[PDB]
Symmetry: C2
């Protein structure tokens, strides 16, 4: 399938582009500036080798995709979603977004509503799927690294959720787990500030989570 990584110029986008393209999916890296996206797409192809990774302006990436992943920072996510609303409203949109703040006492969940539900409202969409929030980006973007992580997935539409879970299952090392309706997204998103706190107070590097 075709997967657009909106703002996919960071490590999560890089990891998804490299791993999914190697599996045969057509990846489109999106960025505010087309030149930036094409440049990063070129970079990923060199690492990945002979695979389909192309770069486009976010609007064109969204237009061309089946699934759009919002790899943009939370701080600019609502504005980006709003601008792409008409295009994204009919696509499956995956939100790995988390409202988290750093503070003197550690990391906190900084919203009264979840990022995924806010995005669903801004998009007026029934196809938003919350997933991929707890994937250690640097480790994920390193193709020599092996891992065993679980990926909780939330969403109101059974079909969209099933498609996204199937896609995640194709990546060796990731196990998707259904966490229910989008109303449970706050519980999934909260794992990020919890993990950042564990990293901070125990002097540990990036971590994923496993339920067993």
């Amino acid at each position: 399938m075709r997967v657009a990584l909106l703002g996919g110029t960071g490590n999560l986008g890089k990891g998804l582009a490299l791993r999914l393209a190697t599996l045969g999916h057509e990846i489109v890296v999106g960025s505010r500036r087309e030149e930036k996206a094409e440049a990063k797409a070129a970079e990923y192809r060199r690492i990945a080798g002979d695979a389909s990774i192309t770069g486009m302006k976010n609007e064109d990436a969204a237009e061309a995709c089946d699934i759009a992943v919002l790899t943009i920072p939370w701080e600019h996510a609502i504005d980006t979603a709003r601008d792409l609303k008409n295009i994204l409203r009919e696509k499956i949109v995956v939100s790995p977004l988390v409202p988290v703040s750093r503070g003197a006492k550690g990391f906190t969940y900084s919203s009264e509503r979840s990022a995924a539900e806010i995005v669903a409202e801004v998009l007026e969409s029934e196809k938003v799927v919350s997933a991929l929030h707890t994937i250690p980006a640097a480790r994920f973007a390193n193709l020599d690294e092996k891992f065993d992580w679980d990926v909780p997935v939330c969403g109101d539409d059974d079909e969209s959720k099933k498609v996204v879970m199937s896609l995640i299952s194709e990546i060796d090392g990731l196990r998707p787990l259904d966490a229910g309706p989008l109303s449970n997204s706050r519980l999934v998103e909260s794992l990020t500030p919890l993990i950042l706190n564990i990293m901070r107070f125990n002097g540990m590097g990036e971590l994923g989570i496993k339920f067993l």
Copy 2:
């Protein structure tokens, strides 16, 4: 050291009594009636063998302990803490409590403030340590059970937190991880409803968590 398991007649209390007693700690199983606590302790002693597991009224167990673990359901936990306030405010109190609501769309975190912070407020104590919320009770009570679980620990008093972390570290199969001040307890307590959702929507048995 001495550990009081208040309302420790359930599986979490069972698992803790057996494992800590076998490690050489003096365990006091607490209950409303002295005679019923005594019977539960006897049942545990027969499983554990030559170990120190004694039964007492909750009030007496708390008074005799160094650490008191609130192994009671959330429903009447605050009333229980309040009743034992004068005794507990001077001891290290461990809270594995989680405010959870069960509805049509899954499980949700049902409090604005965390259970641990509410307990500290009622007790007017700085020695509350939040820990052990994500230990599958029935599995933990079975000594032949294989598991590798991490246990996030929150608390404002470093000495008290260190004591509790050292205690948990002694139990094979558990690894305590510092999650910061008590203000991060909501993030830790939130793992329970998340796991209950994962269990419900994937048809899984009780699970613990591991960071890796």
